[PDB]
Structure formats: structure tokens, C-alpha cells
Ligand binder design. Structure first.
Ligand SMILES: O=C(O)CC[C@H](NCC(=O)[C@@H](O)[C@H](O)[C@H](O)CO)C(=O)O
Length: 326
């Protein structure tokens, strides 16, 4: 669009944090202009590429979206020295993706409904007898299929080993189908999830930690836990055939720097991906406690496996779409 670099993320508090900490200061430093857009699924970028009319330059996607998007020819190969890979978690920087943060897909519950005695595991989240009430789940499968595997009693370190079999994949879908009548909303965006929490419209929800903490900061009577949460990685990629490819490459190089990443958790509960940010910002242990990647929080989580999603995303999207139709 115009001569502006077009950058797209998923709206709300998360997009505002990226804009304030990364996009606006990096564009100012490079004397460049940018336009924001919002989207919820990388398939929208795929639609642009397949139509021959590409308007987006930079897209903010998840680490488990990257293998699928790359295989579909949706992403540009990045310039080899865009970042120093040593400054980022291993595997978080690929030839087509640069991480910007770590986050958790976790359990949050309504304190009006359950008080302090809320679901503290996926087995509890799926237990309608022990915890009666309205559930909310994402309308996309990443973090949801694995939550079902954990609810079936799979150890956190064996999630993907259990999902490697047709039997395990069908059992996780059966477990979601069993829960489906108690699911009152299949939320689509992080801001919609935060609003359900602020309004107390759901009794429990599986959503992103920063969205939950922001809703609690805004007065929501909810609590959450990192136990059984999925440790995710968000980042940037450049759309294949981007109208401002070279400018976008320079913009991505700049915004990935430690001097901008340090400001990312200022007004949104997220964890910068650039390890050098931690030395600059010197976060308080209180601030550290809110971060998905903090050692205390990591111990009770499992990391998303992009290799599982590279193999089974098509099957998972179709089987999960069928669950939500109920
Ligand atoms: O990294 C963070 O701290 C933010 C976590 C979380 N992001 C999940 C995510 O990748 C979404 O932004 C969208 O599904 C994605 O950008 C659309 O491809 C959120 O929006 O809250």
C-alpha cells in the first residue's frame, strides 16, 4: 500500500505493544513510513500470494505456522545476516522467520465461578464434572489438539510422541468432541478472548498469557496458571512477492535489535526473543514472573513442535473444524 511498508499482526494489546516498542521507533531510526494491518490466520497471506495481488510486506506469525507457510510458497527467504542467531533461542530464527517474542497458550479461569480452586491442569480444564461451566477455546488447532492430549493424561514431555500415531491423534480429537458441548465460544482473536475474560462471559478459557494478564490489569476477576501451558514463539516473515521487499528486510533487521526488544514488555505481558534485551532492560523479578520463557514458568510447560504441524496441520485443521461445528 502506497510507498509504505505494510506490517500485519493480530490486533489488540499485542499489536499496540509491537507498534510502540518496535515499529514506530525502528521506522523513525530508518526514516521510513509504514502502514499497519490486522489478520488472524497465515492462510490470508496465502490467499494474497495465490491471487497475485500482494499488499502485505511483513506478517507476524507463529513458529509452528512457518513450516506450513514456507512449504506453500508464502514466505520470502530472508537475507542471511538479518539477525545474529546466537542472540535468539535455538530454532527461533530460520531462513524465513525471525522471532520477536515467547508467549504461553495457557488456562485462565473465572474467580467468580471457582474462586482460587480453578482448573490447574488440562485434565481439570476437560473435567466438566469437577468444574462445571462454560469453556472457550481458539477456533484454530495449535495448542488445542495438544491440550486434549494432555487432558488424556499424556506427560508434558510426550505430547508429540503420543500425537505421532493415528490412534493418539484420533483420541485427542475424541477428547475435544467430548468437551465440545461445554464450549460456549470458539474465540477468534486475542482481543475477543480478553473481552470474554473482562466481561466474565466464560468460566474458563485456553488463550495467550499476555491477553489474560491485560484483561486482569483491566479489572477482570480471573486467575491463570502456566501449568500444562504451551510455550510458543511469535515472529516475523516477509510475504513472497512483497511490494516493498528490500525496505521490509531493512525494517525487520532494525526492529529485531535489542534496543527495541527491551521495550516490548513495557505495557504488554510478553517475553522478548532477543536474549540481549534482558541485559539492557534489567527486568524486576515481578516483571520476570509474568514471562512465558522465565525459568520458573518454563519448568511447568512444554514447547510447541513446528515439525508436528509441518506434517499434520491439514488433518488437524479439518478434524478441529468438524469439532467446532457442533
Ligand atoms: O507473542 C506474544 O506475546 C503474543 C501472543 C499471541 N500471538 C499468537 C499469534 O501468533 C497471533 O498473533 C496470530 O494468530 C498470528 O499473528 C496470525 O498469524 C497474541 O496475539 O496474544
Amino acid at each position: 500500500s502506497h510507498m509504505d511498508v505494510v506490517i500485519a499482526s493480530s490486533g489488540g494489546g499485542w499489536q499496540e505493544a509491537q507498534d510502540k516498542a518496535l515499529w514506530a521507533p525502528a521506522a523513525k531510526a530508518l526514516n521510513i513510513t509504514y502502514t499497519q494491518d490486522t489478520f488472524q490466520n497465515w492462510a490470508e497471506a496465502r490467499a494474497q500470494v495465490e491471487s497475485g495481488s500482494v499488499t502485505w510486506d511483513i506478517i507476524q506469525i507463529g513458529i509452528a505456522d512457518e513450516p506450513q507457510a514456507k512449504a506453500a510458497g508464502v514466505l520470502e527467504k530472508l537475507d542471511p545476516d538479518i539477525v545474529n542467531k546466537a542472540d535468539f533461542p535455538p530454532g527461533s530464527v530460520t531462513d524465513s522467520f525471525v522471532a520477536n517474542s515467547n508467549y504461553s497458550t495457557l488456562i485462565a479461569w473465572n474467580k467468580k465461578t471457582y474462586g482460587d480452586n480453578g482448573p490447574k491442569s488440562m485434565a481439570d480444564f476437560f473435567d466438566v464434572k469437577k468444574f462445571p461451566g462454560k469453556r472457550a477455546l481458539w477456533n484454530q488447532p495449535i495448542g488445542m489438539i495438544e491440550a486434549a492430549a494432555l487432558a488424556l493424561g499424556t506427560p508434558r514431555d510426550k505430547v508429540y510422541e503420543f500425537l505421532s500415531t493415528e490412534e493418539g491423534r484420533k483420541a485427542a480429537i475424541a477428547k475435544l468432541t467430548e468437551l465440545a458441548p461445554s464450549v460456549s465460544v470458539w474465540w477468534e482473536s486475542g482481543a475477543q478472548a480478553a473481552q470474554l475474560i473482562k466481561d466474565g462471559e466464560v468460566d474458563m478459557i485456553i488463550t495467550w498469557g499476555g491477553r489474560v494478564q491485560g484483561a486482569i490489569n483491566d479489572g477482570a476477576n480471573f486467575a491463570y496458571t502456566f501449568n500444562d501451558a504451551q510455550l510458543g514463539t511469535d515472529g516475523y516473515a516477509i510475504v513472497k512477492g512483497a511490494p516493498h521487499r528490500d525496505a521490509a528486510m531493512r525494517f525487520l533487521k532494525e526492529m529485531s535489535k535489542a534496543e527495541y526488544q527491551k521495550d516490548l514488555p513495557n505495557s504488554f505481558a510478553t517475553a522478548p526473543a532477543n536474549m540481549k534485551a534482558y541485559d539492557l532492560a534489567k527486568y524486576t523479578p515481578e516483571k520476570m514472573a509474568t514471562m512465558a520463557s522465565a525459568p520458573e514458568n518454563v519448568a511447568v510447560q512444554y514447547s510447541v513442535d513446528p515439525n508436528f504441524w509441518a506434517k499434520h496441520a491439514k488433518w488437524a485443521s479439518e478434524a478441529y473444524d468438524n469439532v467446532r461445528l457442533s
